[PDB]
Structure 1
Amino acid sequence: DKEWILQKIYEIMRLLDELXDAEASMRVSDLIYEFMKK
């Protein structure tokens, strides 16, 4: 479930964006980028 991995992780990213971390959202999105790319 690599695509379900992407699913869970971008749900994490959307919730991070809503919580207002901004910081966490941006570079954990860097994490997800280097996750789905690699």
Structure 2
Amino acid sequence: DKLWILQKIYEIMVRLDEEGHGEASLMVSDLIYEFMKRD
């Protein structure tokens, strides 16, 4: 379902920020936005 992959994407975003990859976290943020704008 949509909820597992949402959670995995969210987790990557968080992990990237904790590991200092802020810029790549912003890019994953944009994907979350796009994904949830779908039905």
Query: What TM-score results when the alignment is normalised by the length of structure 2?
Result: 0.76
- Size of the aligned set, in residue pairs, is 38
Identical-pair percentage: 74
Query: What TM-score results when the alignment is normalised by the length of structure 1?
Result: 0.77
Unmatched 5+ stretches in structure 1: none
- 1:37 and 2:37 matched: yes
Whether the aligned pair in 1 keeps the contact of 2:13 and 2:25 (CA below 8 Å) is yes
Larger radius of gyration: 2
Unmatched 5+ stretches in structure 2: none
Distance 1:14 1:22 in 2: 9
